[PDB]
Write a protein that binds this ligand. Sequence first.
Ligand SMILES: *[C@@H]1O[C@H](CO)[C@@H](O[C@@H]2O[C@H](CO)[C@@H](O)[C@H](O)[C@H]2NC(C)=O)[C@H](O)[C@H]1NC(C)=O
Ligand SMILES: *[C@@H]1O[C@H](CO)[C@@H](O[C@@H]2O[C@H](CO)[C@@H](O)[C@H](O)[C@H]2NC(C)=O)[C@H](O)[C@H]1NC(C)=O
Ligand SMILES: *[C@@H]1O[C@H](CO)[C@@H](O[C@@H]2O[C@H](CO)[C@@H](O)[C@H](O)[C@H]2NC(C)=O)[C@H](O)[C@H]1NC(C)=O
Ligand SMILES: *[C@@H]1O[C@H](CO)[C@@H](O)[C@H](O)[C@H]1NC(C)=O
Ligand SMILES: *[C@@H]1O[C@H](CO)[C@@H](O)[C@H](O)[C@H]1NC(C)=O
Ligand SMILES: *[C@@H]1O[C@H](CO)[C@@H](O)[C@H](O)[C@H]1NC(C)=O
Ligand SMILES: *[C@@H]1O[C@H](CO)[C@@H](O)[C@H](O)[C@H]1NC(C)=O
Ligand SMILES: *[C@@H]1O[C@H](CO)[C@@H](O)[C@H](O)[C@H]1NC(C)=O
Ligand SMILES: *[C@@H]1O[C@H](CO)[C@@H](O)[C@H](O)[C@H]1NC(C)=O
Ligand SMILES: *[C@@H]1O[C@H](CO)[C@@H](O)[C@H](O)[C@H]1NC(C)=O
Ligand SMILES: *[C@@H]1O[C@H](CO)[C@@H](O)[C@H](O)[C@H]1NC(C)=O
Ligand SMILES: *[C@@H]1O[C@H](CO)[C@@H](O)[C@H](O)[C@H]1NC(C)=O
Ligand SMILES: *[C@@H]1O[C@H](CO)[C@@H](O)[C@H](O)[C@H]1NC(C)=O
Ligand SMILES: *[C@@H]1O[C@H](CO)[C@@H](O)[C@H](O)[C@H]1NC(C)=O
Ligand SMILES: *[C@@H]1O[C@H](CO)[C@@H](O)[C@H](O)[C@H]1NC(C)=O
Ligand SMILES: *[C@@H]1O[C@H](CO)[C@@H](O)[C@H](O)[C@H]1NC(C)=O
Ligand SMILES: *[C@@H]1O[C@H](CO)[C@@H](O)[C@H](O)[C@H]1NC(C)=O
Ligand SMILES: *[C@@H]1O[C@H](CO)[C@@H](O)[C@H](O)[C@H]1NC(C)=O
Ligand SMILES: *[C@@H]1O[C@H](CO)[C@@H](O)[C@H](O)[C@H]1NC(C)=O
Ligand SMILES: *[C@@H]1O[C@H](CO)[C@@H](O)[C@H](O)[C@H]1NC(C)=O
Ligand SMILES: *[C@@H]1O[C@H](CO)[C@@H](O)[C@H](O)[C@H]1NC(C)=O
Lengths: 487, 487, 486
Amino acid sequence: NSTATLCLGHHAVPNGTIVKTITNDQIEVTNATELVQSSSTGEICDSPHQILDGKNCTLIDALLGDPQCDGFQNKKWDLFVERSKAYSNCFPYDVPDYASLRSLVASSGTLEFNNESFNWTGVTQNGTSSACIRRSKNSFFSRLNWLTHLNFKYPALNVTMPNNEQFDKLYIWGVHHPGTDKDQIFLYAQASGRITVSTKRSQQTVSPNIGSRPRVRNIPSRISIYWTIVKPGDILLINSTGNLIAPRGYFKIRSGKSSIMRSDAPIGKCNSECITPNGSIPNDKPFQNVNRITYGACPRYVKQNTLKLATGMRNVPEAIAGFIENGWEGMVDGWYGFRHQNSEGRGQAADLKSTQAAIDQINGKLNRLIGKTNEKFHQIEKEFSEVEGRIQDLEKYVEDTKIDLWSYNAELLVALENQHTIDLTDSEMNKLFEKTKKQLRENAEDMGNGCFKIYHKCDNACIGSIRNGTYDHDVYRDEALNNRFQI
Amino acid sequence: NSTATLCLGHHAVPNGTIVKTITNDQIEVTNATELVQSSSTGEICDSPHQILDGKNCTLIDALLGDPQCDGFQNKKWDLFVERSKAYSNCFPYDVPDYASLRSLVASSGTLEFNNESFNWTGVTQNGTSSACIRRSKNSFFSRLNWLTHLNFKYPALNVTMPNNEQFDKLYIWGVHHPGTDKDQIFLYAQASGRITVSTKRSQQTVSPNIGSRPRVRNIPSRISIYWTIVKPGDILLINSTGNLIAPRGYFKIRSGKSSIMRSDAPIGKCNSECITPNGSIPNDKPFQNVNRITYGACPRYVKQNTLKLATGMRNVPEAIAGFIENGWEGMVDGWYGFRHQNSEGRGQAADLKSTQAAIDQINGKLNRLIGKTNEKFHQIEKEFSEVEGRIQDLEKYVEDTKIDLWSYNAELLVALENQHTIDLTDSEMNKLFEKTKKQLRENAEDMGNGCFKIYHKCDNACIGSIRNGTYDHDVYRDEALNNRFQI
Amino acid sequence: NSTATLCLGHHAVPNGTIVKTITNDQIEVTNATELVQSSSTGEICDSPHQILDGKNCTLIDALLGDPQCDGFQNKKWDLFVERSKAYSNCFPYDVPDYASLRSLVASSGTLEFNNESFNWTGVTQNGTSSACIRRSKNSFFSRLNWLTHLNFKYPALNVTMPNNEQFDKLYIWGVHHPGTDKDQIFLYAQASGRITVSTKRSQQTVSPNIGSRPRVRNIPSRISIYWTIVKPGDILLINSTGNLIAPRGYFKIRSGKSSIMRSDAPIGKCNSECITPNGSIPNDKPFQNVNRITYGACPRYVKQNTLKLATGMRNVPEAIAGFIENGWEGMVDGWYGFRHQNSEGRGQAADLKSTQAAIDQINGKLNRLIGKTNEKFHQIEKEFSEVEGRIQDLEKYVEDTKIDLWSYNAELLVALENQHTIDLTDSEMNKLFEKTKKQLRENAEDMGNGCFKIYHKCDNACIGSIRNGTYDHDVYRDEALNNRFQ
Ligand SMILES: *[C@@H]1O[C@H](CO)[C@@H](O[C@@H]2O[C@H](CO)[C@@H](O)[C@H](O)[C@H]2NC(C)=O)[C@H](O)[C@H]1NC(C)=O
Ligand SMILES: *[C@@H]1O[C@H](CO)[C@@H](O[C@@H]2O[C@H](CO)[C@@H](O)[C@H](O)[C@H]2NC(C)=O)[C@H](O)[C@H]1NC(C)=O
Ligand SMILES: *[C@@H]1O[C@H](CO)[C@@H](O[C@@H]2O[C@H](CO)[C@@H](O)[C@H](O)[C@H]2NC(C)=O)[C@H](O)[C@H]1NC(C)=O
Ligand SMILES: *[C@@H]1O[C@H](CO)[C@@H](O)[C@H](O)[C@H]1NC(C)=O
Ligand SMILES: *[C@@H]1O[C@H](CO)[C@@H](O)[C@H](O)[C@H]1NC(C)=O
Ligand SMILES: *[C@@H]1O[C@H](CO)[C@@H](O)[C@H](O)[C@H]1NC(C)=O
Ligand SMILES: *[C@@H]1O[C@H](CO)[C@@H](O)[C@H](O)[C@H]1NC(C)=O
Ligand SMILES: *[C@@H]1O[C@H](CO)[C@@H](O)[C@H](O)[C@H]1NC(C)=O
Ligand SMILES: *[C@@H]1O[C@H](CO)[C@@H](O)[C@H](O)[C@H]1NC(C)=O
Ligand SMILES: *[C@@H]1O[C@H](CO)[C@@H](O)[C@H](O)[C@H]1NC(C)=O
Ligand SMILES: *[C@@H]1O[C@H](CO)[C@@H](O)[C@H](O)[C@H]1NC(C)=O
Ligand SMILES: *[C@@H]1O[C@H](CO)[C@@H](O)[C@H](O)[C@H]1NC(C)=O
Ligand SMILES: *[C@@H]1O[C@H](CO)[C@@H](O)[C@H](O)[C@H]1NC(C)=O
Ligand SMILES: *[C@@H]1O[C@H](CO)[C@@H](O)[C@H](O)[C@H]1NC(C)=O
Ligand SMILES: *[C@@H]1O[C@H](CO)[C@@H](O)[C@H](O)[C@H]1NC(C)=O
Ligand SMILES: *[C@@H]1O[C@H](CO)[C@@H](O)[C@H](O)[C@H]1NC(C)=O
Ligand SMILES: *[C@@H]1O[C@H](CO)[C@@H](O)[C@H](O)[C@H]1NC(C)=O
Ligand SMILES: *[C@@H]1O[C@H](CO)[C@@H](O)[C@H](O)[C@H]1NC(C)=O
Ligand SMILES: *[C@@H]1O[C@H](CO)[C@@H](O)[C@H](O)[C@H]1NC(C)=O
Ligand SMILES: *[C@@H]1O[C@H](CO)[C@@H](O)[C@H](O)[C@H]1NC(C)=O
Ligand SMILES: *[C@@H]1O[C@H](CO)[C@@H](O)[C@H](O)[C@H]1NC(C)=O
């Protein structure tokens, strides 16, 4: 006829994704990305972090020198992996404040040990027992020196070890608790007395407690493990009359990124910045639901199993009509575009500048959210195997508080980001419509269905001029006004 | 007249509510709902949680078997309620790590106790004291066995109790600290030694400390309470030469939805998921300002006394003018609507579809905020009666940090939700205006007061057609253009 | 001519500021303000808080009565400032739980001490040491009483001190751990022994551990410090056979806005509510990056080095054209305005009401961020000089969690406020444009460049009438319609 229809609209897909917003909880979008990492590879990767596989050893067993842990002497790690199927196979022992010594060594990151010559005179060195078998022979912990009487005497030891280095020295020592008085005399030839280990800054006094304990590996006695840190310029003084499991030297304390994790996952040859007890995970997504226990440049742990961030506009499946009534399922070149009815025929073209503007805004939002990780190393324990009381309750409370707060932040962030993304794509659709209306001026009317009725003869070249912003409204003003406002 | 005026507007109320938004701290709205529960009912509900009223007893007194607490033997609970007017009325005692044992038992949720045939030979069982009167005669704690000499002899005990069950056993035992050497000899016939209670996994050694304490209920001596947890497959060994307040058996350790609260509120016949020290509270609102100490599906504690969530549009009290100049007080059928002046007279009708769309979006937000309360049980202590130091300070810091962060989240959430509520109601008013404008095409002009001037004669049926969305602009186009563009 | 052009637009500046929004990481705005305090004055301000400079003393040395701390006796403070240069010069000692006693006293906020007469009979009072020189004479801690034998006997002490007051009494006492057995006999005339200090509610039993330790200031022995809190109506009972460093009275326990801070900053004559280890800082900004350790009405600590809050509109550098194509670099009277071309030359005038509306919304926003501060006093230790284990790990975890969450809140808040600010200035520009369009009705067309083409001769009086909202579209309707549609 003497008019034409130019409809503006946007693409749609047959199978969209349901996302949450502020306005609604179940709104369909054309595309979305998952922001919660919900699965692991099942293996701990050797790179980029140095992984020390504990095998059958615990970190403390490796520290003390348990005969099965000889392969752990002087090792370094970024993450120590402690296996569930691990056990002591040496003299029964315990550690008051076990969690603290384990934390100290895991944080330090090394078992580097330097032997020192202690003046252990008047006593017999290198005591052994059938509990600790090293090479089919009776042994003891490789980093401890079990001192016993010499010729039925155990003279009081007053042994000085100055710290003349520029680093802190970690000394591991213990106290033997015999299972009977007969053992106390056999090994030390005198009453228990007490052991005092002191520095200029601190002191520790431990008394032996002789008596039977349930046998562990047929041993009715125990060794208690104690430690001390000697600062540069300080002096370690050990005063003992018996029952001393002496240090053979010191371990270095380092500051660093090292930690310990409990995991039965195998260790494999892959590169992954994040490590969890379930194995390494990708750290692209901002959130994870694999484990609360993490090491490295990991995503933050949330309770939500899935959070999907819209990466497209509202999906609205389906004469010509535009964005007000529905989306266009026949558009594959871009997100926004034009469809028209002319004298020559019907056609369609995408508006690639508006499409890219919407994509760049989405890309910017994804860039702020994706690839930004939070690198954490030594942290509190999050899983417990014993009922300890007030301190464990506080550690659980702190972790649950952190998880609830980050889950809230993730839920609010995703709902705000999805509401904003929809608003951005609606704004781009509306800007394209307003641009077209302003370009057409008085030569077209808004039909209320996202289309313009053009009141002058319009060919495909004219539509092309409109689409790329080169339409001259004055050339057609007289025809359009005569048709629009009948005279 | 040859023309008519069709005005669009929205309701207003004589008494609005002041809410906060991001843009303005004090915006008046037609309606708002409180999101902070600031008052309790004053009573603790018997349902749905099992409530154990401690009456005159603390949890530890019920655990030990204080005579006034005999009514709590073998009881179970979901929440143990500890009264301020509670006191011990038995032998004076203390508990190292009292908070840990109280938490441990409260978390377990039961006083179920199984007696065991301990081989307490060579000693006299069931010692009593005048401090503990049961049935008007001298007694002792019902779950403790005060062992004394037999015929002026107290042979060393080496008593083994294997754990052959599939569950952990909690053994409660103590150490008697006589107030004089005469009591130590009178009761045990020998000087004090040490008590060692050990397992394959752990050991505890406690020495008696003879000496006077300020008398409590006329007793100068004290009992210290210790506990041990025996895992399946382990063995309990009690090694003692005197001063042992022996277990009579064990308590079962459970893990579940159980805790302890200090409260003086009465307990009554009601059903409420959330229990606070001030009594049960409703759990419909997302936040509460009653107490930081809660149990069950409770709203999160915030510092704000009030937070009002807008549930309506901004209140703008009042020929005809629309939403740009004011709201309409005289409209009760809906939130959005029309007023007109035509050839027949004045009139008004509400637009019910826009009203419902706004309401549905508000109800969506309300459903997101209301009734989504998260359920928490055993947590940490938040109120303290004694000055303890570093651990109490950390617990207070953790709770204050949590409260400040949730108060921030509540303030930001309400300001964002109220700003969004205003934006949605303004968007619905604007959408109704744009819809009307598009329906009218060139037959009407925007007068800048929220009204359209229609340039053709209108009857009530025509205005109704416009409200319905059935208005045909072509049958009126020639009249409206001849009048609208008259020179 | 027969037509006129009336353009609407907004100002621009030669050089704006880059801020973050939700939509983009770097948007240029005409003005922005810093919300993170990144520097201190270098001095601790004298008021409003009561500041006690520890000089060469620690809080514990001041508590015990170290000779260098006599000037701190019976003092009160809101903030105790502990210097990194502080050192002890008295008998060597330790505290089994040093952090708890230091926190306890710092929280109490006072060294007020009330002497009590204890029945220390049969023993020698006021023992001294060459380690603690007060006036060129051997002395001891001024709040401790080193008891020794009398005539080579130390009878067992059973000393009762009832609490008949209405407040909690803090008793500081200790145990001497001699360096050998000769010291134990020389001082107490008997080996070993045990000290029990008890109340109705609790008891503490400490054994001396005789033996050498590394010499500190030439003293091979140590004193361990213990404390007891006695509630009103309770009794302090001290039972000792030797090695007792007795109390001389009690310290009052209070509850209030008091704490302790470690800092080497000097104390000035400044008045500032917020104190950090680096010195006091302004507390006007909602956030700070000076230190995680704060006292008083301080901004919250964030990791961000800077956060800029837009305080103006987007900066769009600059026939005539309006806001769709460019801003106006030549408009310095307001933020929004009109520029016109008619037969009588060209001109410009600012729209003062839209400018003020945008400013009022921004000032409202600033009042929600600036000044409002959360005041905190005693907290937790955030920096450590020793490797302690599980408790230190938890304290660090809690503080890092708090910082990460507040840094998140600060980034989200600033991005939301900047995106909203941009939306506010775009909305005000669009509202002024729509207002003009509604006033002009059919007498003008929107040219798509932020300007209106008016189809009737619009003189400076017509354009002034339009700018102030007094334009009558009917007066010019016949001319404008004849020029526009014919
Ligand atoms: C205390 O009792 C325990 C257990 O009843 C004794 O330990 C047992 O000793 C025998 C050998 O005498 C072993 O065959 C058992 O396997 C041991 N069992 C356990 C659980 O240790 C212990 O010897 C007793 N102590 C004294 C001093 O008599
Ligand atoms: C140590 O002193 C306390 C308190 O001075 C003595 O306890 C008092 O003993 C008398 C009876 O001898 C009672 O009437 C008082 O009520 C007790 N008071 C308190 C606070 O317990 C205690 O007996 C003394 N001990 C020794 C061994 O002399
Ligand atoms: C135990 O050893 C320490 C250190 O080897 C002895 O302390 C030293 O004593 C001499 C005096 O005899 C002083 O000059 C040194 O400065 C001391 N050194 C330290 C580090 O304190 C201590 O005397 C010895 N104890 C016994 C009982 O022999
Ligand atoms: C979603 O976007 C990704 C690119 O990020 C693309 O590979 C994928 O095919 C898209 N899916 C849909 C349904 O549009
Ligand atoms: C662990 O111990 C078992 C025996 O209990 C042995 O068969 C296995 O090979 C050990 N593993 C390693 C890595 O040494
Ligand atoms: C003790 O054993 C170590 C090796 O662990 C050896 O170097 C040292 O000489 C031995 N000492 C004695 C006294 O046998
Ligand atoms: C401390 O060392 C001295 C000197 O050898 C000794 O006589 C004393 O018994 C030692 N004490 C302890 C507890 O080892
Ligand atoms: C990771 O391991 C924990 C502990 O076994 C388990 O609860 C969790 O479901 C696991 N997650 C995945 C993704 O395997
Ligand atoms: C716009 O499109 C028309 C027809 O497709 C073409 O002739 C014209 O050169 C184009 N202009 C620009 C700037 O791309
Ligand atoms: C606000 O809404 C509630 C229902 O949600 C209603 O009961 C109340 O009367 C309303 N108040 C006003 C002023 O509209
Ligand atoms: C609840 O009790 C606490 C005291 O434990 C009190 O401070 C608070 O104001 C009370 N709240 C209400 C709503 O009664
Ligand atoms: C609790 O103790 C009071 C006396 O203080 C007594 O009157 C009351 O009956 C007791 N209640 C129970 C349940 O034993
Ligand atoms: C001790 O008292 C309990 C109470 O149940 C009783 O069963 C037991 O037989 C008594 N034993 C002796 C030796 O009195
Ligand atoms: C443990 O029992 C044995 C049994 O002979 C005894 O000799 C030993 O002294 C006891 N120890 C304690 C601490 O009771
Ligand atoms: C139009 O609106 C009027 C209002 O009263 C109503 O009665 C009539 O049924 C409506 N018609 C349609 C087709 O919606
Ligand atoms: C920014 O605002 C401040 C007042 O807060 C004003 O003094 C300054 O001149 C403004 N700068 C610009 C470029 O507008
Ligand atoms: C601190 O001690 C030094 C001596 O080491 C002294 O010179 C200085 O004046 C002291 N400072 C104060 C404030 O007393
Ligand atoms: C101990 O010293 C104090 C210091 O104030 C003094 O008042 C008291 O009389 C002295 N007592 C003896 C016995 O020297
Ligand atoms: C407690 O005081 C009495 C007083 O007669 C004394 O005999 C006993 O040894 C004291 N005990 C301690 C631990 O001081
Ligand atoms: C404040 O002091 C800490 C510790 O010395 C330092 O790390 C930080 O950079 C300082 N900040 C400023 C603004 O001086
Ligand atoms: C508006 O401006 C015109 C021309 O400047 C002036 O004559 C008129 O009085 C002004 N009206 C108001 C209300 O300022």
